[PDB]
Design a protein around this ligand. Structure first.
Ligand code: HEM
Length: 184
């Protein structure tokens, strides 16, 4: 179960975040710990495509090799706070699992600048829900979390020390597929 009403960044700059580029997850915190594996790789692209607000997601479990992509259109609840109805696709945008009622995530940008961000997401997916999940993002897949984003983690009354890093997983991404999935 999700439990947090995450607060969006004051003065969030939507066009800069949703610029069509890629964000890498460098660290994550699942509130229900056995909710997700202890080793993971995830990234997204976020942009407007033909007037529509979009995200493309990539998940990879580096131990099992489980891999999946998703595309969503985001609807706006308030500045920096969205509800997204996802379709599972291959890397080329071919639909594997269509959009359906009940399959959605919420997405809140708690902090962002040109290079880093802190987000919250709540996944709803039939009998495969996840609880609250926070992620530190960077434009550079190898960047250690800096002071701006770590201060934002503190300001959210979270302990960065509890976040799990993705950096020791040999994560390798297909940026081209994430960018082109925005259109799909
Ligand atoms: C970056 C922000 C993230 C968003 C918006 C997000 C969103 C999603 C969505 C929409 C799905 C379902 C996809 C489908 O069935 O087609 C999913 C599944 C999953 N995600 Fe994430 N995710 C993110 C990051 C992460 C991270 C960092 C982890 C763990 C390190 C993670 C772990 C999982 C797992 C294990 C599943 C499959 C299990 C399930 O569907 O219940 N995700 N995620």
């Amino acid at each position: 179960a999700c439990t947090k009403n995450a607060i969006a960044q004051t003065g969030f700059n939507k066009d800069k975040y949703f610029n069509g580029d890629v964000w890498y997850v460098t660290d994550y915190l699942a509130l229900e710990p056995d909710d997700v594996p202890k080793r993971y790789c995830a990234a997204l692209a976020a942009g407007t495509a033909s007037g529509k607000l979009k995200e493309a997601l990539y998940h990879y479990d580096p131990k099992t090799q489980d891999t999946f992509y998703d595309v969503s259109e985001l609807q706006v609840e308030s500045l920096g706070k969205y509800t997204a109805n996802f379709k599972k696709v291959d890397k080329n945008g071919n639909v594997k699992v269509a959009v359906t009622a009940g399959n959605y995530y919420t997405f809140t940008v708690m902090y962002a600048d040109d290079s880093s961000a802190l987000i919250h997401t709540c996944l709803h997916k039939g009998n495969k829900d996840l609880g609250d999940l926070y992620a530190v993002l960077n434009r550079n897949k190898d960047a250690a979390a800096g002071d701006k984003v770590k201060s934002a983690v503190s300001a959210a009354t979270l302990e960065f020390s509890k976040f799990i890093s993705t950096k020791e997983n040999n994560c390798a991404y297909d940026n081209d597929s994430l960018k082109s999935l925005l259109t799909k």
